[PDB]
Design an enzyme around this catalytic site. Structure first.
Site, PDB file in Angstrom:
ATOM      1  N   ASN A 122      -3.472   6.406   4.127  1.00 49.76           N
ATOM      2  CA  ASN A 122      -4.382   5.427   3.552  1.00 49.76           C
ATOM      3  C   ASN A 122      -4.280   5.526   2.039  1.00 49.76           C
ATOM      4  OD1 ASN A 122      -6.227   3.323   3.571  1.00 49.76           O
ATOM      5  ND2 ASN A 122      -7.862   4.502   4.598  1.00 49.76           N
ATOM      6  N   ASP A 125      -6.372   8.337  -6.079  1.00 52.42           N
ATOM      7  CA  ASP A 125      -6.163   7.391  -4.997  1.00 52.42           C
ATOM      8  C   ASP A 125      -7.520   7.270  -4.274  1.00 52.42           C
ATOM      9  OD1 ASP A 125      -3.301   6.840  -2.739  1.00 52.42           O
ATOM     10  OD2 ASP A 125      -4.963   5.566  -3.225  1.00 52.42           O
ATOM     11  N   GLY A 180      -0.456  11.645  -0.159  1.00 57.05           N
ATOM     12  CA  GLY A 180      -1.033  11.942  -1.461  1.00 57.05           C
ATOM     13  C   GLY A 180      -2.301  11.289  -1.955  1.00 57.05           C
ATOM     14  N   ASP A 223      -3.571  -9.297   6.298  1.00 56.75           N
ATOM     15  CA  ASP A 223      -2.688  -9.266   5.140  1.00 56.75           C
ATOM     16  C   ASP A 223      -1.462 -10.162   5.090  1.00 56.75           C
ATOM     17  OD1 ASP A 223      -4.322  -7.140   4.150  1.00 56.75           O
ATOM     18  OD2 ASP A 223      -3.151  -5.758   5.378  1.00 56.75           O
ATOM     19  N   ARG A 277     -13.630   1.836  -1.431  1.00 54.25           N
ATOM     20  CA  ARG A 277     -13.302   1.044  -2.616  1.00 54.25           C
ATOM     21  C   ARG A 277     -14.592   0.547  -3.232  1.00 54.25           C
ATOM     22  NH1 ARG A 277      -8.216  -2.106   0.302  1.00 54.25           N
ATOM     23  NH2 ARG A 277      -6.869  -0.242   0.336  1.00 54.25           N
ATOM     24  N   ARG A 317       1.283   4.298  -5.183  1.00 51.70           N
ATOM     25  CA  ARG A 317       0.423   4.759  -4.097  1.00 51.70           C
ATOM     26  C   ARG A 317       1.237   5.517  -3.037  1.00 51.70           C
ATOM     27  NH1 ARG A 317      -2.857   0.296  -0.371  1.00 51.70           N
ATOM     28  NH2 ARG A 317      -3.068   1.508   1.574  1.00 51.70           N
ATOM     29  N   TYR A 356      -8.155  -3.132  -5.443  1.00 55.54           N
ATOM     30  CA  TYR A 356      -6.903  -2.859  -6.141  1.00 55.54           C
ATOM     31  C   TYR A 356      -7.077  -2.896  -7.661  1.00 55.54           C
ATOM     32  CZ  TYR A 356      -3.772  -3.019  -2.033  1.00 55.54           C
ATOM     33  OH  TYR A 356      -3.107  -2.725  -0.882  1.00 55.54           O
ATOM     34  N   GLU A 376       4.372   3.087  -2.695  1.00 54.31           N
ATOM     35  CA  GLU A 376       3.883   1.763  -2.347  1.00 54.31           C
ATOM     36  C   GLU A 376       3.162   1.180  -3.537  1.00 54.31           C
ATOM     37  OE1 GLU A 376       1.328   1.961   1.026  1.00 54.31           O
ATOM     38  OE2 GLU A 376       3.016   1.578   2.435  1.00 54.31           O
ATOM     39  N   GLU A 377       3.232  -0.141  -3.659  1.00 56.06           N
ATOM     40  CA  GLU A 377       2.504  -0.872  -4.692  1.00 56.06           C
ATOM     41  C   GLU A 377       2.491  -0.305  -6.106  1.00 56.06           C
ATOM     42  OE1 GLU A 377      -1.099  -0.763  -2.454  1.00 56.06           O
ATOM     43  OE2 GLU A 377      -0.645  -2.655  -1.432  1.00 56.06           O
TER      44      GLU A 377
END
Ligand SMILES: *[C@@H]1O[C@H](CO)[C@@H](O[C@@H]2O[C@H](CO)[C@@H](O[C@@H]3O[C@H](CO[C@H]4O[C@H](CO)[C@@H](O)[C@H](O)[C@@H]4O)[C@@H](O)[C@H](O[C@H]4O[C@H](CO)[C@@H](O)[C@H](O)[C@@H]4O[C@H]4O[C@H](CO)[C@@H](O)[C@H](O)[C@@H]4O[C@H]4O[C@H](CO)[C@@H](O)[C@H](O)[C@@H]4O)[C@@H]3O)[C@H](O)[C@H]2NC(C)=O)[C@H](O)[C@H]1NC(C)=O
Ligand SMILES: *[C@@H]1O[C@H](CO)[C@@H](O[C@@H]2O[C@H](CO)[C@@H](O[C@@H]3O[C@H](CO[C@H]4O[C@H](CO)[C@@H](O)[C@H](O)[C@@H]4O)[C@@H](O)[C@H](O[C@H]4O[C@H](CO)[C@@H](O)[C@H](O)[C@@H]4O[C@H]4O[C@H](CO)[C@@H](O)[C@H](O)[C@@H]4O[C@H]4O[C@H](CO)[C@@H](O)[C@H](O)[C@@H]4O)[C@@H]3O)[C@H](O)[C@H]2NC(C)=O)[C@H](O)[C@H]1NC(C)=O
Ligand SMILES: *[C@@H]1O[C@H](CO)[C@@H](O[C@@H]2O[C@H](CO)[C@@H](O[C@@H]3O[C@H](CO[C@H]4O[C@H](CO)[C@@H](O)[C@H](O)[C@@H]4O)[C@@H](O)[C@H](O[C@H]4O[C@H](CO)[C@@H](O)[C@H](O)[C@@H]4O[C@H]4O[C@H](CO)[C@@H](O)[C@H](O)[C@@H]4O[C@H]4O[C@H](CO)[C@@H](O)[C@H](O)[C@@H]4O)[C@@H]3O)[C@H](O)[C@H]2NC(C)=O)[C@H](O)[C@H]1NC(C)=O
Ligand SMILES: *[C@@H]1O[C@H](CO)[C@@H](O[C@@H]2O[C@H](CO)[C@@H](O[C@@H]3O[C@H](CO[C@H]4O[C@H](CO)[C@@H](O)[C@H](O)[C@@H]4O)[C@@H](O)[C@H](O[C@H]4O[C@H](CO)[C@@H](O)[C@H](O)[C@@H]4O[C@H]4O[C@H](CO)[C@@H](O)[C@H](O)[C@@H]4O[C@H]4O[C@H](CO)[C@@H](O)[C@H](O)[C@@H]4O)[C@@H]3O)[C@H](O)[C@H]2NC(C)=O)[C@H](O)[C@H]1NC(C)=O
Ligand SMILES: *[C@@H]1O[C@H](CO)[C@@H](O[C@@H]2O[C@H](CO)[C@@H](O)[C@H](O)[C@H]2NC(C)=O)[C@H](O)[C@H]1NC(C)=O
Ligand SMILES: *[C@@H]1O[C@H](CO)[C@@H](O[C@@H]2O[C@H](CO)[C@@H](O)[C@H](O)[C@H]2NC(C)=O)[C@H](O)[C@H]1NC(C)=O
Ligand SMILES: CC(=O)N[C@H]1[C@H]([C@H](O)[C@H](O)CN)OC(C(=O)O)=C[C@@H]1O
Ligand SMILES: CC(=O)N[C@H]1[C@H]([C@H](O)[C@H](O)CN)OC(C(=O)O)=C[C@@H]1O
Ligand SMILES: CC(=O)N[C@H]1[C@H]([C@H](O)[C@H](O)CN)OC(C(=O)O)=C[C@@H]1O
Ligand SMILES: CC(=O)N[C@H]1[C@H]([C@H](O)[C@H](O)CN)OC(C(=O)O)=C[C@@H]1O
Ligand SMILES: *[C@@H]1O[C@H](CO)[C@@H](O)[C@H](O)[C@H]1NC(C)=O
Ligand SMILES: [Ca+2]
Ligand SMILES: [Ca+2]
Ligand SMILES: [Ca+2]
Ligand SMILES: [Ca+2]
Ligand SMILES: [Ca+2]
Lengths: 388, 388, 388, 388
Positions: free
Chosen positions: D266, D244, D217, D70, D290, D212, D324, D196-197
């Site tokens: 995660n 999520d 969560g 990343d 994903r 996120r 994403y 996040e994000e």
């Protein structure tokens, strides 16, 4: 600035001069050229560009395998500079889909792309490069449109769509858009029995579309639209000079209000300029396949069921592959008349050339001259063997 | 804005400085560079660009095989940014054809491309990137034009065309266009006996063209045009410093009104700046082939049949390949005079280098300096072996 | 619009933030990236771009073999979008040559390229993308200039040139140009004993250049120019923190008016920001080779012969290759001060990595922050083995 | 011209129409397409473009090996024309770094990139393509931001950042920028336990962000910002329709003010449109990976802890890879309402497809329609085997 109005008549067509040619397949043999098909040409007030349905892969790319297929999630309407090839780096995506049309109204451009599975397709109408209106399938059987430019008059841009069978009666609609919004729509009327892929042009406030009767006609259906009254009529080109493909041999008398028989469930997108004695028809030379291309002057073809050629011009030899053809004009040129133009799609690969796993094309385009110019033939020019 | 007028005289040429170089063949060994030939340079009021006749394939592409041929349906006049190479992705097609000319009149650009078979070619004149006029072959034997820029004065842009034999008398015409329309045309007059590929420039309302007498002359024919009266004269450069190629060795006295003999039916496009003592001639160093290139100051070359060099500058060594050369100037630069410029086409491949199956070129260009600058040689720079 | 004037002082440099990085060598391993060296960065009022001397071939191209050489007929100053790599398709040629400088005066850009053989080089000064002035070699021994941007003040753009020996006294001149024309020039004055590749910046109507004393100095010579009076002075950075390369270890006292000894006939283009306590010096970490790069805050470095670091920031690890470095600033940014910036050339290939036959580089660039930012190292990032 | 104000409410979402698709991985198999990840879409007043974090190498390039990572010095935020793929030649670098956000305020664009090592990262805020402000890490543990567009209202553009643990409480801050300068910042408040994000959008002077909760969560935290008062609140989407991934199966009652348990440490960047009955949630079809993507109409999802779907639309089949997803809207379109849009990142390669050494993605994007359109699925479309 202001909406363009179809105020001029067609210029006298005495011959055809070369306008554009991208040699896409030749060049793409060793450069990043996108696989395409269903090309056309369309002008903006300050530029004319090539358009086509990309297959979302380059010709040399491994994903070119299978591009004979017409509808996938990887297709998109792209445009690129006149006579340049459609490359990964110069192609501008107008919208996503596998059937399209596009036209500038003088102020900005309207583009339409249809996507989805066969029974659940939808059209998205973009205006000023933004999505504005959506139309869901009404017959749940491959909603489809022109595959060449639409025409506008004072902001009103009619577009012909068909949803339903390709081998029996279908549901054709003429939509009248303005700024990407629907003003009105009407079901096809007149004597045309099946309509697909209309090729249109405008002059003196009238829009003429020469289409494809896939079901039964070897002569071509014709839709004439009044963009002010937002009404239309339909019939067939009367002339015995048949212009669809495949087709039976030419008879001595055609049909004005019915499909000329002999070939069913097949055809090719084509076009014509119907303007009295100044009438010119385009067609493949072969009656069996998309081979060759010629322009024939057939005075009063639209209304005279015995009209035969008085002049002609070969565009592509019968020993070279052709394909779709359609009309466009630069409505923003100088002068007192609109210069008729057309393009011919030169298909290469499958199914005619099956040593390669792909299907693509290049484009050749001509406009009319008032001179009687000498003629040349314009093949795609690529060598399939180089791709093996 | 307003049409440009040739109001300035030439700047004093005391030497030549490097202006542009694209190293096209070197770069194209590993990038998508189009095969070309017959290049030139031409300026717009806000930009100067390289021009050439593409062969419709990249150099590394398999379709590069056979590009020694001059006329095909895959050629087109393209232009691209100064000193960049002509790539698939940056080349703008100006028109389709295998012979061309182009020039900006101050308001917009006129481009002309000739296409067709040898006995039925036609010229299409584009203005403001739209086709405006067409001219059919008059002698049915390779209608052809300059292969370098034309020049305009108050909207009038003369262009020299030739149709007919390349080895006997032909039919040369001077066309006077304005906004892409023909104002007038006249047949060649004067003492020049054969005209091909004129290289022109303008100063003080007069346009001078140095051309190629392919039939019999090793000295170069010269056409001087009055763009206002739309009239012209023609003769040969009097000087014994012969500038065509191939050519016999230099004599001590030349010919003013007849071709200097010794070599028939061959030649190369070339140029000169004829301005009294400020006269400079370009030529290949070799008298046998398109090898090397030099500029020679030959005072009064046009009118003095015994004029010899008083200064010179080597542009390309005799051990390097050259080719066509022509004139252009940035008519929109600042200052009180027009700075003379020229380009040299550096041909690589066939027929001189036949280990490869292609023929292409790169470009080198220089402009004049009022300084007496040191000199360097400017070869194409590519290694043919790399292409094997 | 109007000529830019150096009316602001430097912003306080408390650290350096990442500004641009093109990862050219990494990307060029599989794309058409041009081989380059001697890069820099320069801003126009509406855009900042990367600049460099192309070698006229791509990195993967066979013609990349031999690019360790500095001067050839295939080099040219090119510019391209910030942080993009210099590709065949996005690189704009500013002029032809093997030594350059360039700067915008607020109205338009001046670019200078020097070309020719070692004993007969010449500089061509371009303004508004047109050639305007030419200067012939005065010492006939590699006429050469900055290799980074020049700076302008009210239309006057000084440029430092050197002609002559690289291992003894040479003839350095400061030229003052305005609109590409020479206003005045003066021979180097002051105590700097040898000058090469000056790195300049401007603030409060004064232009400061940190250069390279190739002959004897390991400390860097400094030329300060008054662009209004068109006069200058020269000396050396007094500080014992030596910044050329190769160089001897750092002493406790430097030299203000003479080269600090220990290494002769070698060096590297470098830079500094000399602004009292707000003084920062750049240098390679290695004293032996172009390895690593760090910025050191050395208060009053220019005038204090015992000045040592008070803060620092590592830019490139000593285990990674660096190279040339120079200054530039966006003189057209908002705010009350000019933000100091610099670039570091990350050289790859020969001579340090001789498994490949080429020499190229990528670029990394930083600007100052008034914050005390955390630091990262920024290597070229390519794997030479991938090129084998 | 003037700062844009969020004066409109959302249009009624009755279905989703195809907006853009770049087929990047398919095309990049044989063209110079950059490896990317963390894409998004963002509009300027006259154009909408694709954005992503490049990995500084092409997919076919050898440097693609290792792109599953990343954060590296070779990453940068790039943007390119809508539906075109991110190529070396058309990608514009907005800034350097491995975490970003970007948004246009009506006058110009603000872009933010974070770079550096995990314990010393820093954000650089660019405005009008110039660096303006820098923010150093406050928790020294991967300073990170949205990975999708921010939203502006009268010049004020809030941005959510997080610094600290990804598996426990972290330090999230909401920064309020105007012209790239910090007006104010506040620490996260409300009941969201980890952020996040964030994926944001604006309507009627309120900005809603769906983020996120990586720590605990499976329901998504929601931050609602008042850009005028420069204040905010936070909670979780109450609905039992968990969005999520990975996540436990859907329960019958969710949690409004705490993370819904079952999966720790995660997640995946996601989004939603929370507008009463006009509420639509996006999510992967798979609860484990994903895989797939669907939109679900869940009336009052934000406030109703028992809310279940009333309508839906599949975007990507469960047999295809997703990734994403985030929100964006064209705030400069015509009409009386803002048309909700989103993109889905289609990740290919590692870790799910480890036969290749790289990780990249393509993009698919949709906008809402007031029609009830038929649905199609939109996979990346590439064949991994082709890359072997
Ligand atoms: C330099 O350039 C110039 C400019 O281009 C060249 O001059 C051109 O030359 C062309 C070819 O000779 C010519 O084109 C032909 O024109 C004919 C019309 O002109 C003639 O008739 C009129 C009317 O009486 C006269 O006034 C005139 O003076 C001429 O005599 C057309 O009839 C020609 O088309 C027909 O022939 C071609 C084959 O050449 C077919 O491909 C075409 O489809 C037409 O024939 C078919 O169709 C008709 C109509 O139904 C049938 O009757 C006929 O049997 C054919 O049908 C079969 O084939 C079709 C197609 O495959 C199939 O569907 C069907 O079932 C049947 O199997 C042709 O168009 C240009 O007009 C002329 N231009 C000018 C300005 O002069 C010049 O030669 C060049 N110079 C050199 C040195 O090369
Ligand atoms: C740094 O840079 C500077 C700047 O460039 C360099 O200085 C330049 O040096 C050049 C080379 O010495 C020089 O160019 C020559 O100039 C001659 C003219 O000057 C001389 O004559 C005048 C008049 O009396 C004097 O005033 C003057 O002071 C000089 O003495 C030209 O005559 C030269 O061209 C001729 O020679 C070259 C070969 O070098 C041929 O290629 C060329 O075609 C000319 O010769 C042929 O043609 C003539 C004309 O018909 C015939 O008489 C002759 O026999 C040759 O004919 C054969 O060859 C041709 C071609 O192949 C063929 O067609 C024919 O049939 C025959 O076989 C040459 O142009 C520059 O003027 C000079 N510039 C300046 C400002 O000084 C300097 O050297 C560089 N410094 C370093 C250290 O390198
Ligand atoms: C998160 O990020 C932050 C922000 O970057 C990180 O904090 C930074 O940390 C840096 C490294 O520790 C630091 O940089 C150093 O600063 C020193 C100056 O500060 C110190 O001195 C002053 C003055 O008394 C004090 O006020 C201050 O508090 C400090 O104590 C410099 O002196 C350092 O440079 C010297 O060391 C490096 C090696 O680390 C050399 O490469 C460099 O060239 C300097 O040393 C050489 O040169 C001097 C001068 O002549 C000689 O005296 C010395 O012997 C060395 O000479 C040899 O080496 C050179 C080069 O190879 C050769 O030419 C010569 O011949 C000899 O062989 C260094 O610049 C930052 O200032 C600091 N920033 C801030 C805001 O705090 C933080 O660590 C990061 N956090 C984490 C967790 O990583
Ligand atoms: C032409 O195109 C049109 C337009 O797209 C097509 O028509 C569309 O058809 C869709 C599919 O049938 C339909 O979408 C579904 O809508 C359902 C809601 O509508 C129904 O309920 C309301 C309310 O009572 C009624 O009013 C209405 O009339 C309907 O009966 C949704 O409920 C559907 O989503 C659920 O199913 C899909 C599987 O198909 C799941 O993937 C999805 O996640 C939902 O189910 C999961 O989640 C719920 C909520 O917690 C659970 O209760 C359930 O058990 C599932 O949970 C499991 O799976 C999830 C995900 O893996 C996992 O997390 C969890 O742990 C469990 O394991 C679905 O959205 C469109 O609305 C409809 N559009 C229109 C306008 O009609 C038409 O078919 C096409 N024509 C042709 C010929 O193809
Ligand atoms: C096309 O025709 C329509 C006439 O319907 C023209 O549209 C009048 O034009 C002026 C300036 O735009 C306005 O003040 C009128 O209200 C316009 N429209 C209508 C519908 O009446 C249009 O200008 C014509 N296009 C061109 C290029 O002349
Ligand atoms: C830089 O400083 C000079 C002052 O020398 C400014 O140039 C006066 O500017 C106005 C408008 O251009 C003219 O009417 C004067 O005659 C200008 N020039 C001189 C030389 O006096 C220049 O405008 C300043 N630049 C900026 C951006 O303000
Ligand atoms: C929407 C669509 O599929 N159009 C296809 C069209 C269609 O099959 C025909 O109109 C009969 N219905 O045919 C052809 C074709 O080369 O013949 C290509 C088009 O891609
Ligand atoms: C229209 C055309 O063919 N022009 C060709 C021209 C022509 O053959 C010559 O002018 C003699 N007639 O020659 C050459 C050449 O390299 O010599 C190239 C041109 O492509
Ligand atoms: C004009 C020229 O050749 N410049 C070269 C320069 C020069 O050799 C040095 O300034 C000593 N005279 O050195 C270097 C170098 O990497 O060291 C590269 C430059 O290309
Ligand atoms: C700054 C950064 O590394 N962002 C990464 C992000 C982060 O790891 C997560 O938010 C948990 N902290 O995760 C992912 C991911 O595909 O899951 C990719 C991002 O590149
Ligand atoms: C590069 O050039 C050198 C010198 O001519 C030669 O020996 C070497 O083999 C070449 N290597 C390649 C890979 O061309
Ligand atoms: Ca390639
Ligand atoms: Ca049919
Ligand atoms: Ca001759
Ligand atoms: Ca030194
Ligand atoms: Ca989670």
């Amino acid at each position: 600035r202001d909406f363009n109005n179809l105020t001029k008549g067609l210029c006298t067509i005495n011959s055809w001069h070369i306008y554009g040619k991208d040699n896409a397949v030749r060049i793409g043999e060793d450069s990043d050229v996108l696989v395409t098909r269903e090309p056309y040409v369309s002008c903006d007030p300050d530029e004319c560009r090539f358009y086509a349905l990309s297959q979302g892969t380059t010709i040399r790319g491994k994903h070119s395998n299978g591009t004979i297929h017409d509808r996938s999630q990887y297709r998109a309407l792209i445009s690129w500079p006149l006579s340049s090839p459609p490359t990964v780096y110069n192609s501008r995506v107008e919208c996503i889909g596998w059937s399209s049309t596009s036209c500038h109204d003088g102020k900005t451009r309207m583009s339409i792309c249809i996507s989805g599975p066969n029974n659940n397709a939808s059209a998205v109408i973009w205006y000023n490069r933004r999505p504005v209106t959506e139309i869901n399938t009404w017959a749940r059987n491959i909603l489809r449109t022109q595959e060449s430019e639409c025409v506008c008059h004072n902001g009103v841009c009619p577009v012909v769509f068909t949803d339903g069978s390709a081998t029996g009666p279908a549901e054709t609609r003429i939509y009248y858009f303005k700024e990407g919004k629907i003003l009105k729509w009407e079901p096809l009327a007149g004597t045309a029995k099946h309509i697909e892929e209309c090729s249109c042009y405008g002059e003196r406030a009238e829009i003429t579309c020469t289409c494809r009767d896939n079901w039964q006609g070897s002569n071509r259906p014709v839709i004439r639209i009044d963009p002010v009254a937002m009404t239309h009529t339909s019939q067939y080109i009367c002339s015995p000079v048949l212009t669809d493909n495949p087709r039976p041999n030419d008879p001595t008398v055609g049909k004005c209000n019915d499909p000329y028989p002999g070939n069913n469930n097949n055809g090719v997108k084509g076009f014509s300029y119907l303007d009295g004695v100044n009438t010119w028809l385009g067609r493949t030379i072969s009656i069996a396949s998309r081979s060759g291309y010629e322009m024939l002057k057939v005075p009063n073809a639209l209304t005279d069921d015995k009209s035969k050629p008085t002049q002609g011009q070969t565009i592509v030899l019968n020993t070279d592959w052709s394909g779709y053809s359609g009309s466009f004009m630069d409505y923003w040129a100088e002068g007192e008349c609109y210069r008729a133009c057309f393009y011919v799609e030169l298909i290469r690969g499958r199914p005619k050339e099956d040593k390669v796993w792909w299907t693509s094309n290049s484009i050749v385009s001509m406009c009319s001259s008032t001179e009687f110019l000498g003629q040349w033939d314009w093949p795609d020019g690529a060598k399939i063997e180089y791709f093996l």
